[PDB]
Amino acid sequence: PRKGPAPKRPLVNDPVYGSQLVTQLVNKVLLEGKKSLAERIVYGALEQAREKTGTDPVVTLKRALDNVKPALEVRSRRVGGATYQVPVEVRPDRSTTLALRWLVNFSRQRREKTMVERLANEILDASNGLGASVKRREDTHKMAEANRAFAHYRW
Amino acid sequence: GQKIRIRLKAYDHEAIDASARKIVETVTRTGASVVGPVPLPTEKNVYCVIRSPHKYKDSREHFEMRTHKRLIDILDPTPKTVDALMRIDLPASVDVNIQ
Amino acid sequence: AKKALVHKANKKPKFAVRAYTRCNKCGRPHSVYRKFGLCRICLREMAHAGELPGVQKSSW
Amino acid sequence: ARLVGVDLPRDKRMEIALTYIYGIGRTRSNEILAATGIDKNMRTKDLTDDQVTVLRDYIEGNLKVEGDLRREVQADIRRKIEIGCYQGLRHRRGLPVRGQRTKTNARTRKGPKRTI
Amino acid sequence: GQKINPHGFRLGITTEWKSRWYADKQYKDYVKEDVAIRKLLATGLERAGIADVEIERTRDRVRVDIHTARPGIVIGRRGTEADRIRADLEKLTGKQVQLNILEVKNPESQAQLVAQGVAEQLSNRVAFRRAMRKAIQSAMRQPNVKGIRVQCSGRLGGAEMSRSEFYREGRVPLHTLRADIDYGLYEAKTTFGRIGVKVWIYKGDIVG
Amino acid sequence: PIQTVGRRKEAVVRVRLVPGTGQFNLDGRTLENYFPNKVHQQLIKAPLVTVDRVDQFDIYAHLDGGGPSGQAGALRLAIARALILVQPEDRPALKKAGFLTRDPRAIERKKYGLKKARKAPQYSKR
RNA sequence: ACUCGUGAGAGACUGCCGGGGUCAACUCGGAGGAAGGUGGGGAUGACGUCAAGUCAUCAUGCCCCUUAUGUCCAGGGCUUCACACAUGCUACAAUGGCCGGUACAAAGGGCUGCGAUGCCGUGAGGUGGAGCGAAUCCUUUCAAAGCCGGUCUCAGUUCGGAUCGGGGUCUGCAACUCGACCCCGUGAAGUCGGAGUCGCUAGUAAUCGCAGAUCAGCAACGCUGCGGUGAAUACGUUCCCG
Ligand SMILES: [Mg+2]
Ligand SMILES: [Mg+2]
Ligand SMILES: [Mg+2]
Ligand SMILES: [Mg+2]
Ligand SMILES: [Mg+2]
Ligand SMILES: [Mg+2]
Ligand SMILES: [Mg+2]
Ligand SMILES: [Mg+2]
Ligand SMILES: [Mg+2]
Ligand SMILES: [Mg+2]
Ligand SMILES: [Mg+2]
Ligand SMILES: [Mg+2]
Ligand SMILES: [Mg+2]
Ligand SMILES: [Mg+2]
Ligand SMILES: [Mg+2]
Ligand SMILES: [Mg+2]
Ligand SMILES: [Mg+2]
Ligand SMILES: [Mg+2]
Ligand SMILES: [Mg+2]
Ligand SMILES: [Mg+2]
Ligand SMILES: [Mg+2]
Ligand SMILES: [Mg+2]
Ligand SMILES: [Mg+2]
Ligand SMILES: [Zn+2]
Structure with a gap:
């Protein structure tokens, strides 16, 4: 990484619908690299989410991404023998990756008796503002405006 | 129609091709029809033994066995042709299977 | 490799179960390869000297 | 339900209900189920007494289960630990037979781990 | 190693x-x-x-x-x-x-022959200094050979310690696989023990 | 007669194109039964739609070497090169798509001292 | 007429252009091209250090036994075990276990050895034995994850398999210590884990199989290689190690 900016892979778009956000989502939800089962789980969860919400799946996913996408993040630094938290803005691509990846790693952890339904129901909870994603958004913002005053370092 | 399989099957590229050229020339001035040295899967043996005794096994070396095999499918097995065939003297590199 | 042990292994034993390899050059009971009949150290030194017909560095 | 003094599950398949009996495992459960001809996917709610009785008769006729198995195994252990063989000594001192790594494994035979 | x-x-x-x-x-x-x-x-x-x-x-x-x-x-x-x-x-x-x-x-251009000669000289009475001087000069006398190195390890002169000393003169590309390297070694006998001699011979290069 | 071969990590395929219908035959069966994964189905229907010559070429394919994704990518490349061979005028478009250039990555050398590929065993300094 | 395999040759050399450049090296971008600026990975360890490891691979100076510390089997132990550390395997369960149906690999071994078809066994295996010194015959048409259908509704569980006992096979003169494999019952323990710590920047990580090999069996989850599904990110050196 020292030598310069590494080239970025040209990720392919989802052909079933037309949004590459699904491709990134299946890449994140990959468990030991079994894409066939992973993507069929993703599509089944999206179908049951459609059945639950009665609206457009792509519109719901875009709404969830808009609701849980960040703008500021907190980084750690040690100066003079003491560690401090400094906030720095993030690029929208990084923001989307964090939003979807927090969505999935929180959908991993409910007790709804089955995680194929947990995926869709966390999607719904992020959409309506009652999810683990949105509560982490509240916590991260609380930490952000708690430590905005350290922005003078600008690192 | 009788087919006899002339096998030029050994290790090394240079000597095996020398033998193949000699066999092709023998067929040429003997008057027979032969396809020639058709490519065949060469056997590749890999053996791993540790380069140092008494531990120090993280660094090693590999060895290779390239077993080169040629097929010479002769047509019209003339008795004089086959006589010249086993009267040819070949170097120790190549082994012939007259089948 | 004690020479008495090597020679005792060389003689035909009372039962076929008592036969192992005992590399000819050095009598090493362990770390042997059959198709050559040589142990690791002997195989390596012979290969480096070029006296065994064929074994060579491989890379792929 | 109830069978040979064993409380059958409230709602479970017979292939597991029969394994809950001491003397029957998965393979013999499948074998006995195939022999009797009853479906293996039927729920507990649909059991009827006559099949239970005939299965009980079959299993008591052809196999030994539960308390009798307790007595044969414990009597064998006491006998062959009285005769004093190597397995007898292993049972006496509470260590496994098969000569596995008692170095660090066999903590199943050792029970809980106590630090010295 | x-x-x-x-x-x-x-x-x-x-x-x-x-x-x-x-x-x-x-x-x-x-x-x-x-x-x-x-x-x-x-x-x-x-x-x-x-x-x-x-x-x-x-x-x-x-x-x-x-x-x-x-x-x-x-x-x-x-x-x-x-x-x-x-x-x-x-x-x-x-x-x-x-x-x-x-x-x-050319007996002086082959690795084994010069190694055996140096081993015999070291064994009988000849000191490593003069032995290697003579060997190196006889080597570079031949026009065809260019780079020479000779090495010995073990107890030199009967001292109770191991000396590893070598002389280099010319070009010997070990890393260059094209280089024509002639390798030889031998174990010399001595009253105090045994000393190993190691020699590398560079003689031109081949193209093709 | 136009021929092509796909090259994806030790997987080799051979497909024959026919100017007939858009029917796919993979070792005696269609794509819908052979390898029922929508990602595969779409990546196989992609070249014809992106060249906008849909439902105009029959393919008869033979499969060998490698595994599932290797064969999918191998026939992927096979039709990718066959379309250019029969119609080179879309070569700039496909290479701008990045689609005529094969991806030459495969299982790398397994190294001595390593569990597999490049991974190292557990390390402790104590 | 293609892969199939193995020969010869060609193809990456900043080849060409714009700009910075001391008009010099060099760099960014752009067209062609399969690759663009050592395309990817290996073999390839400069002088030297740790008096680093190896007199049980081998060879060897000295000292020591020579009627013993030599030889041979009158069997056994190298695997014993109140406990710790180190590296792995299998998991801790539903992206799952089990059952039925079902499609794709590479490379490699085989003479006192691989072993077909057939019959008997739950299965180790037993009878019998074609084809092979081997692109042919056996390692099954080399598969597993992969797709479809059915169960389990989260339980110390249909997860999870040890422990012990009861019954056989296989190598062998002879399986008690001290083998492996096959069949049954056996149902304990444990719910992602303490500071600290490891490896990984493209077929990589992660996961699922096969094979070289020593061998007569076998502690074979190992070493080595051969494969299968296949990601994420790099804002930049202020902090830690080299
Ligand atoms: Mg043996
Ligand atoms: Mg050996
Ligand atoms: Mg390959
Ligand atoms: Mg691999
Ligand atoms: Mg290791
Ligand atoms: Mg150096
Ligand atoms: Mg030393
Ligand atoms: Mg000693
Ligand atoms: Mg010595
Ligand atoms: Mg001695
Ligand atoms: Mg012993
Ligand atoms: Mg022992
Ligand atoms: Mg260690
Ligand atoms: Mg399991
Ligand atoms: Mg199946
Ligand atoms: Mg099949
Ligand atoms: Mg049978
Ligand atoms: Mg279990
Ligand atoms: Mg637990
Ligand atoms: Mg639980
Ligand atoms: Mg922690
Ligand atoms: Mg596994
Ligand atoms: Mg073996
Ligand atoms: Zn040896």
């Missing part, structure tokens, strides 16, 4: 095999008879340095090639040593064997 055998490294491209035959059925016996006869030759023949030993075998016939600096003692004018070697070969039952004797064109 520091370096692998250059002969093994460049064995696939610039150098050629000394023993060439094919075996799958009884190859263990072929190689064990080969090593046995080579050991007996090395033990019996010490007065004349055997530079190279080469054998090629078909079916039963085997032809052994012996390269030596001078053949006068290797084969007698009447053939006593040849008869002794044939007797040893038939005692190990090497069936029909034919021997060839070839004398080298």
Whole structure:
């Protein structure tokens, strides 16, 4: 990484619908690299989410991404023998990756008796503002405006 | 129609091709029809033994066995042709299977 | 490799179960390869000297 | 339900209900189920007494289960630990037979781990 | 360890095999008879340095090639040593064997011969300094050879410690696989113990 | 007669194109039964739609070497090169798509001292 | 007429252009091209250090036994075990276990060895034995994850398999210590884990199989290689190690 900016892979778009956000989502939800089962789980969860919400799946996913996408993040630094938290803005691509990846790693952890339904129901909870994603958004913002005053370092 | 399989099957590229050229020339001035040295899967043996005794096994070396095999499918097995065939003297590199 | 042990292994034993390899050059009971009949150290030194017909560095 | 003094599950398949009996495992459960001809996917709610009785008769006729198995195994252990063989000594001192790594494994035979 | 055998490294491209035959059925016996006869030759023949030993075998016939600096003692004018070697070969039952004797064109340009000479000089009385001076100067006298290194390790002069000393002169590209490297080594005898001699010979390069 | 071969990590395929219908035959069966994964189905229907020559070429394919994704990518490349061979005028478009250039990655050398590929065993300084 | 395999040759050399450049190296971008600026990975360890490891691979100076510390089997132990550390395997369960149906690999071994078809066994295996010194015959048409259908509704569980006992096979003169494999019952323990710590930047990580090999069996989850499904990110050196 020292030598310069590494080239970025040209990720392919989802052909079933037309949004590459699904491709990134299946890449994140990959468990030991079994894409066939992973993507069929993703599509089944999206179908049951459609059945639950009665609206457009792509519109719901875009709404969830808009609701849980960040703008500021907190980084750690040690100066003079003491560690401090400094906030720095993030690029929208990084923001989307964090939003979807927090969505999935929180959908991993409910007790709804089955995680194929947990995926869709966390999607719904992020959409309506009652999810683990949105509560982490509240916590991260609380930490952000708690430590905005350290922005003078600008690192 | 009788087919006899002339096998030029050994290790090394240079000597095996020398033998193949000699066999092709023998067929040429003997008057027979032969396809020639058709490519065949060469056997590749890999053996791993540790380069140092008494531990120090993280660094090693590999060895290779390239077993080169040629097929010479002769047509019209003339008795004089086959006589010249086993009267040819070949170097120790190549082994012939007259089948 | 004690020479008495090597020679005792060389003689035909009372039962076929008592036969192992005992590399000819050095009598090493362990770390042997059959198709050559040589142990690791002997195989390596012979290969480096070029006296065994064929074994060579491989890379792929 | 109830069978040979064993409380059958409230709602479970017979292939597991029969394994809950001491003397029957998965393979013999499948074998006995195939022999009797009853479906293996039927729920507990649909059991009827006559099949239970005939299965009980079959299993008591052809196999030994539960308390009798307790007595044969414990009597064998006491006998062959009285005769004093190597397995007898292993049972006496509470260590496994098969000569596995008692170095660090066999903590199943050792029970809980106590630090010295 | 520091370096692998250059002969093994460049064995696939610039150098050629000394023993060439094919075996799958009884190859263990072929190689064990080969090593046995080579050991007996090395033990019996010490007065004349055997530079190279080469054998090629078909079916039963085997032809052994012996390269030596001078053949006068290797084969007698009447053939006593040849008869002794044939007797040893038939005692190990090497069936029909034919021997060839070839004398080298430049004894000072071959790794084994100079190594044996330096080993003999070191063994009898000659100091490593003068021995290596003479060896290096005799080496660079020949125009064809360019780069020379010689190394010795062990107890030098009878001291109770190990000296590892080497001399370099010219160009010897170890890392260059194109380089024509001639490798040789020998174990010299001494009253205080044994000392190893290691030599590398660079002689031109080949293109193709 | 136009021929092509796909090259994806030791997987080799051979497909024959016919100017007939858009029917796919993979070792005697269609794509819908052979390898029922929508990602595969779409990546196989992609070249014809992106060249906008849909439902105009029959393919008869033979499969060998590698595994599932290897064969999918191999026939992927096979039709990718066959379309250019029969119609080179879309070569700039496909290479701008990045689609004529094969991806030459495969299982790398397995190294001594390593569990597999490039991974190292557990390391402790104590 | 293609892969199939193995020969010869060609193809990456900043080849060309714009700009910075001391008009010099060099760099960014752009067209062609399969690759663009050592395309990817290996073999390839400069002088030297740790008096680093190896007199049980081998060879060897000195000292020591020589009627013993030599030889041979009158069997056994190298695997014993109140406990710790180190590296792995299998998991801790539903992206799952089990059952039925079902499609794709590479490379490699085989003479006192691989072993077909057939019959008997739950299955180790037993009878019998074609084809092979081997692109042919056996390693099954080399598969597993992969797709479809059915169960389990989260339980110390249909997860999870040890422990012990009861019954056989296989190598062998002879399986008690001290083998492996096959069949049954056996149902304990444990719910992602303490500071600290490891490896990984493209077929990589992660996961699922096969094979070289020593061998007569076998502690074979190992070493080595051969494969299968296949990601994420790099804002930049202020901090830690080299
Ligand atoms: Mg043996
Ligand atoms: Mg050995
Ligand atoms: Mg390959
Ligand atoms: Mg691999
Ligand atoms: Mg290791
Ligand atoms: Mg150096
Ligand atoms: Mg030392
Ligand atoms: Mg000693
Ligand atoms: Mg010595
Ligand atoms: Mg000694
Ligand atoms: Mg012992
Ligand atoms: Mg022992
Ligand atoms: Mg360690
Ligand atoms: Mg399991
Ligand atoms: Mg199945
Ligand atoms: Mg099949
Ligand atoms: Mg049967
Ligand atoms: Mg279990
Ligand atoms: Mg637990
Ligand atoms: Mg739980
Ligand atoms: Mg922690
Ligand atoms: Mg596994
Ligand atoms: Mg073995
Ligand atoms: Zn040896």
